[PDB]
Design a protein around this ligand. Structure first.
Ligand SMILES: O=C(NC[C@H]1C[C@@H](NC(=O)[C@@H]2C[C@H](F)CN2)CN1C(=O)C1CC1)c1ccc(C#Cc2ccccc2)s1
Ligand SMILES: [Zn+2]
Length: 292
C-alpha cells in the first residue's frame, strides 16, 4: 500500500500560443524515470537545453514563473506545473518547440485533461514528501505568504482589488475537494489598463478573451462571463500550486497567501528550503494511514 512515484503511461502532444511571446508552440509530455522530477526541454535548440522545474532555476518573476539556464529560458510554467501537482505526477519530460509553455484557455483544465487522457503509471519507488514542521512566513509591503504545519495539503488565498468586479478569499483542502473540479478551470485575468501597458513592452502578445478574463474599469468583457463566482482568487490558488511544485517534492502542509504572487511565493520557497529545521522529507509505507 506504499505511496509510489507517478509518471505518464503515454506521450501527449498539444499546440498553443505563449501568453507573453504570442509564439505558436508544440508541447509534448513524456514519461520519465523514478527520481527525475519535472524537466522542461527546449527541442527547438541544438544542442537541446533541459531545465529541471526547481526553485534554484527560477529567473525573473514579474508576469509569470520563468526557468532560466544561461541565456535559455522557459516562460510561464506555473499552470502546467499546477496541473502536474493536481494529478500527483512526480516524473515527466516537457518538450517545447519555443521559449514559452502554451497558455491554452488561461487555465490548467486542458493540461489536466491531456495528462488524464495519457493515463498515469505508478513506479516502483516511494514518493517523497516535504512535511512542514515550523511556520515559515515572508512579508514585503502589504503582501504575505506563509507555510503552516497541517496534516494534509491545503491552500488559502485572499486578494484585494479596489475594482467594481470585486469574493476575494478562498480556502481549499485538496484531500476533501477536487483540484480538477474546484480550481483547474480558473483562468488568468488582465485589467484593460495593464494590457495596454504590457503590449507597449511586447508582453501579453498572445493574450485574448480566448485565453484570459479581460476586465475593464467595471466588468468582465468575456461574452460568456466567469466559470466560478471567485474565479480570480481561484486562479491565484492555481498559480501558487504551480510555484509550490518548484520545491521538487509534494508538500504536506498549508500555504496561505495575502496579495502574494510569483516574486513573494519564490521568496517563501527559498526561505523554506534555507531553514532545514522547518521541514523534513518523508515517505508513506501505507496510503490508508497517510495525511492526504
Ligand atoms: O495581467 C495579466 N496577468 C497577471 C494577473 C493574473 C494573475 N497572474 C497570473 O495568472 C500568472 C501570470 C500570468 F498571467 C499567468 N500566471 C495575477 N495578476 C495580477 O495581479 C495583475 C493585476 C496585476 C494578464 C493575463 C492576460 C493578459 C492579457 C491579454 C489580452 C487580452 C486581449 C487582448 C490582448 C491581450 S494580461
Ligand atoms: Zn496564472
Amino acid at each position: 500500500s506504499m505511496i509510489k512515484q507517478r509518471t505518464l503511461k503515454n506521450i501527449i502532444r498539444a499546440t498553443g500560443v505563449g501568453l507573453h511571446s504570442g509564439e505558436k508552440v508544440y508541447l509534448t509530455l513524456k514519461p520519465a524515470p523514478v527520481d527525475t522530477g519535472i524537466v522542461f526541454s527546449r527541442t527547438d535548440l541544438d544542442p537541446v537545453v533541459e531545465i529541471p522545474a526547481r526553485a534554484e532555476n527560477v529567473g525573473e518573476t514579474t508576469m509569470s514563473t520563468t526557468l532560466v539556464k544561461g541565456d535559455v529560458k522557459v516562460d510561464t510554467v506555473e499552470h502546467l506545473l499546477s496541473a502536474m501537482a493536481g494529478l500527483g505526477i512526480d516524473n515527466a519530460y516537457v518538450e517545447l518547440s519555443a521559449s514559452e509553455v502554451p497558455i491554452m484557455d488561461g487555465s490548467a483544465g486542458p493540461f489536466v485533461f491531456l495528462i488524464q487522457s495519457a493515463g498515469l503509471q505508478e513506479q516502483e519507488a516511494a514518493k517523497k514528501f516535504i512535511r512542514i514542521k515550523r511556520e515559515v512566513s515572508v512579508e514585503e509591503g502589504d503582501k504575505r505568504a506563509v507555510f503552516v504545519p497541517f496534516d494534509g495539503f491545503k491552500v488559502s488565498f485572499e486578494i484585494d482589488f479596489d475594482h467594481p468586479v470585486f469574493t476575494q478569499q478562498a480556502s481549499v483542502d485538496f484531500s476533501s475537494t477536487s483540484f480538477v473540479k474546484e480550481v483547474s478551470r480558473a483562468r488568468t485575468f488582465g485589467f484593460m489598463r495593464d494590457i495596454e501597458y504590457l503590449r507597449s513592452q511586447n508582453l501579453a502578445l498572445g493574450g485574448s478573451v480566448e485565453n484570459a478574463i479581460v476586465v475593464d474599469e467595471n466588468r468582465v468583457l468575456n461574452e460568456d462571463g466567469l466559470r466560478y463566482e471567485d474565479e480570480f482568487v481561484k486562479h491565484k490558488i492555481l498559480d501558487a500550486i504551480g510555484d509550490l511544485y518548484l520545491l521538487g517534492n509534494s508538500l504536506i502542509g498549508e500555504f496561505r497567501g495575502f496579495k502574494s504572487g510569483h516574486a513573494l511565493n519564490n521568496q517563501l520557497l527559498r526561505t523554506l528550503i534555507a531553514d532545514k529545521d522547518a521541514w523534513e522529507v518523508v515517505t508513506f509505507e501505507d496510503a490508508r494511514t497517510a495525511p492526504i
